[PDB]
Ligand binder design. Sequence first.
Ligand code: NAG
Ligand code: NAG
Ligand code: NAG
Ligand code: CA
Ligand code: CA
Ligand code: CA
Ligand code: CA
Ligand code: CA
Ligand code: CA
Ligand code: CA
Ligand code: CA
Ligand code: CA
Lengths: 42, 397, 265, 265, 272
Amino acid sequence: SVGSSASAWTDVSTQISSISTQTSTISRRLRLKEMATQTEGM
Amino acid sequence: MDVLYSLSKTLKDARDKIVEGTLYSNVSDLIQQFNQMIITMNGNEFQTGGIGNLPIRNWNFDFGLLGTTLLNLDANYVETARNTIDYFVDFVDNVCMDEMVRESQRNGIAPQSDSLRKLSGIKFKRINFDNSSEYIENWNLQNRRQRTGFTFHKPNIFPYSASFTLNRSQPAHDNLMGTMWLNAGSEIQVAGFDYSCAINAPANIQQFEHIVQLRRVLTTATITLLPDAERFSFPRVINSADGATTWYFNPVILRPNNVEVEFLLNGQIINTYQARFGTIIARNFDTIRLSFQLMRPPNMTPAVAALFPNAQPFEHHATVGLTLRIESAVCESVLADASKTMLANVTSVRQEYAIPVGPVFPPGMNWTDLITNYSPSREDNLQRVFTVASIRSMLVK
Amino acid sequence: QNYGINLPITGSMDTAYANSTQEETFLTSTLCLYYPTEAATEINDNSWKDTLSQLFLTKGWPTGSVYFKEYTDIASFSVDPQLYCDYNVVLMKYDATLQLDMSELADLILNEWLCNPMDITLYYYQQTDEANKWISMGSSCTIKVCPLNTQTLGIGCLTTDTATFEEVATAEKLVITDVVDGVNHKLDVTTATCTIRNCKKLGPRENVAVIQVGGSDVLDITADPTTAPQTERMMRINWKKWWQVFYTVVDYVNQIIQAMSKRSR
Amino acid sequence: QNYGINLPITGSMDTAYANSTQEETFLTSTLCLYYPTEAATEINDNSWKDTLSQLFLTKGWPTGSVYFKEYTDIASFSVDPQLYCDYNVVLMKYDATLQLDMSELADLILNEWLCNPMDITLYYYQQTDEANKWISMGSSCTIKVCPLNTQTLGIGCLTTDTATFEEVATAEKLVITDVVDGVNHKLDVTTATCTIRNCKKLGPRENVAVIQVGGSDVLDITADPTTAPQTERMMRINWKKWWQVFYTVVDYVNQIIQAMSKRSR
Amino acid sequence: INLPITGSMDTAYANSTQEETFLTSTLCLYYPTEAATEINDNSWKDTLSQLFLTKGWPTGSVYFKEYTDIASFSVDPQLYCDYNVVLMKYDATLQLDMSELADLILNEWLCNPMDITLYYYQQTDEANKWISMGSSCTIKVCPLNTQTLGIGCLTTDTATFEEVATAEKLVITDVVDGVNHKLDVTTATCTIRNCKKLGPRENVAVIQVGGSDVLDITADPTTAPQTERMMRINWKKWWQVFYTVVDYVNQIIQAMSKRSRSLNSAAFYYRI
Ligand SMILES: *[C@@H]1O[C@H](CO)[C@@H](O)[C@H](O)[C@H]1NC(C)=O
Ligand SMILES: *[C@@H]1O[C@H](CO)[C@@H](O)[C@H](O)[C@H]1NC(C)=O
Ligand SMILES: *[C@@H]1O[C@H](CO)[C@@H](O)[C@H](O)[C@H]1NC(C)=O
Ligand SMILES: [Ca+2]
Ligand SMILES: [Ca+2]
Ligand SMILES: [Ca+2]
Ligand SMILES: [Ca+2]
Ligand SMILES: [Ca+2]
Ligand SMILES: [Ca+2]
Ligand SMILES: [Ca+2]
Ligand SMILES: [Ca+2]
Ligand SMILES: [Ca+2]
């Protein structure tokens, strides 16, 4: 859990820079945020 | 900044020297300096705070001098001095706490915490008493460019790096050649490992070399070099490069033969130690090259011959280690140690008053990511905050 | 994507353990069992293959990834074993009369050999290092060797009278010959029936797993008589039936695939 | 004195070593040997039990703490072995034709099992982990098992035509059956002469000590063909008589009881 | 290894690896029975070895492996050596056979087997072909549509299929890439495998002992390449041929290069 507490949006896994990896892994779920309506833009 | 150090030094010497019963012949000069400070201060309004949880305090200085009428001191003098000193003291502490939490990539040396800017003027220059401290002496020097140096005990110049390098590998990780290393703080524990014990190599010898490139030069370093690195010398289950699979490591230690430790500078060698263990010196060095070997024992008793067969299984893995601790050193730049608390003061002030990350220092001021990229901006800002932290710790430890 | 080079690798100790590759390699790979005709005989069921495939289906392997490949006898399998899969399991019966044969089979399939050809008629060969051996296959091999001295003459044998030679093999389907490394040898071999290759032993083949269904561990993979090792992919079992053996394999296949690792070559 | 509960137990590394439990455990404990009829036959004596007891008395074991319990055969012993003593020792002959039976015996006595009952005619059962086996005792057990698919139908067998089932036991007195863990098996057993129990293997039984009197250590306690362990209380002797075996047991009794530990249950 | 390489241009050329690759490698000639017959000698192999021994190749490094004919060789060529030279004659009837032999040995293939009676296969890219070996492979193909029905063929009547190969020991079939085909094959004699072409096999070297350069390695009729290890000689005897080979072997081995992929005794990789 890269964060305050455990959040499924912030659970890095399947890692086959550390911060770069964490950011990419967290960004691979914002594609789901997009079709989950928690966005603001285009 | 020099006037701030002078404020702190004279307030300290006032809290110390100006005590009941003492003699005016010991505090005449300090009383004149205190009175001059009060004169040069009276008539100015300072503001401190406005970032994070720091509260916006206002300082208005209207104080009175000290009458040079006595020979010995009495409580009616000491109490006046103390009720004039506590105000200046908490003022300096709040100034320092407002100055440690500010950053800038553009002229970091140039002051922040605008009360301190106001103090950097020319109407305040009559407050200077003595710039005796190491940090402030080096500050004055660097301003009037000269060869400086901070003396460090067990400096934390190495960022934490624990990692391996495999020059011979397979998916099964059954016959490996490589080197593991842990560079932490002041210590380097390096260890080369061959699973064949150099049966296939020329003259039954396998080389290993570790190259550590510091970010800042050091000088007059005293170093303790020993064999048999302790943390890479017991069984282990290590991860692959890609973090998917794992592999086992059952080490058996041997001694480094033809060991060679070279302290270099700009690629030119400076110091070279061949087969000397224990305490050694390095007059100037930016790069360290530790080059050792694993030499198969030509004569083996049965107990050890049973561990190094001529076939691939290799259930015991020959290793060769080296521990290197930098005990003392002297650096033209500022770092952390195991002796001084300035870094702790700074990080504690920030973690207490909840400062947003600035454009220079990384989040939480993690020394690892702060010394991995020791940019000149970071160096200047770290020097400034360490200096004012020293100035604050001279009053409130 | 460089090939045919060895470059330094790097890593760290802060990386986290990734999710498991089992249940993905089980789909993107293949499994191949080798069983003896005795098992199919004792069983007498024409659907045991589909039964075992449907059982593997629970353990993860899909239906068209598992293969069963029969073999009449240890020697008839040792004759040119062409293993081409991603995870190979071999079942092997214990027979004191076949100790060396089924140890040579292990030393052949478990290890990875770099094999050049041999011209008995013309050349007189020698072994350079402790890992260059001469492996011969065929229906029945009869090998006879004669060492030579410094001046190309025999040592206890005559270069013309073949009978004087020393007999290392007698009617064997597979032979692995290690001779004194550093002296030129002449050979006589019935090349009509058998082919002999000069091979060099390399790192192990992590793709095959031998399972001795019977008596005590006798397999000496390494030819030096000091190691006598027992490896991870060298298993033993006690048996009175075969359905129980195959159920054991199916229930502990994940352990087998954990003890095995896909090839590097 | 809390039972049925597990708490932390603290300690330290400055404590000293207490007086030896030996020479008092020997007094307050009991030792039970399990020898074969072959030994009494080759001996042909009626006072040898008293002889060995008076010998043990020199090692400290009193005369009434030592018990002997003959067993006519490994199979008749595997039939409900009721080991109720504070230190059990067993002497086991070697027979390649009984390798798996005398390995199942070891896997049954060396280990501690939690055995729930089974009702074959009513229910269809499955395993859950690698330690949930089916142990069947009796005079002659003939077991057959048909796996089932998701829709409760047979896989290479018919739920009614019992002869299509797969026979994994043929008249064995003790059977340890491990099958695929994750499918429902329908069983056919001769429940008139054999009792079957769904038994889960807990931590081992430290109160027993097997001594293979003959050949190489073959016993594969653990089903999975990757461990092939050899515990501390699994010993081996080479023999030509039995008096030497018993004198050796006596002379090295202390080491045996050091290798054995009283039960935790 | 997916990691990158680096280098420089100021580094100097190292010494010659020739005169050591001979000592630590092997060579293998593949000649036709016609040569031995024309020669009518028994120690010509020892002669060539004692000749090679001057050019550097030691005694126990050279090998000569006979093949009765081009097709007999084409059926499962077992090349396992560190350097392979092949001498192949010219015959306008065997033109395509000895072009397919080239396409097979010169190049490295990754082969998966095929189950025809139970499945129906297709091609994907321009390098996935079907190679069939054996005594006589008589292949017929019927393309299908999305709904498993014939195009210009009837799935039942084998005699309506399109016969691409009639009594050929080695066939390399390329069909339209994208459609599903049904195949009729003489499985009792031939085995047919779906093989993807990898990079070239730099371990072999073909020598056309006769007529003009006709080998079309690449099946597309636009490239018609002429690779480095594809030589041509004109002959009236075989002794002159072997003497030419021996005298110009260093150039042959300079045009060849030891493999990179892996060790394997077959002429194609098998990965199920
Ligand atoms: C591995 O398990 C974790 C935890 O359940 C999960 O987040 C992750 O997605 C898994 N890996 C894959 C490849 O699904
Ligand atoms: C145990 O033996 C030691 C060593 O002789 C002795 O000091 C101690 O008193 C003994 N303990 C008892 C309970 O007798
Ligand atoms: C390369 O050739 C030069 C010239 O003959 C020689 O001096 C040198 O030693 C050679 N290199 C080696 C590694 O022997
Ligand atoms: Ca043999
Ligand atoms: Ca002789
Ligand atoms: Ca040898
Ligand atoms: Ca039994
Ligand atoms: Ca089970
Ligand atoms: Ca059946
Ligand atoms: Ca053809
Ligand atoms: Ca047609
Ligand atoms: Ca095509």
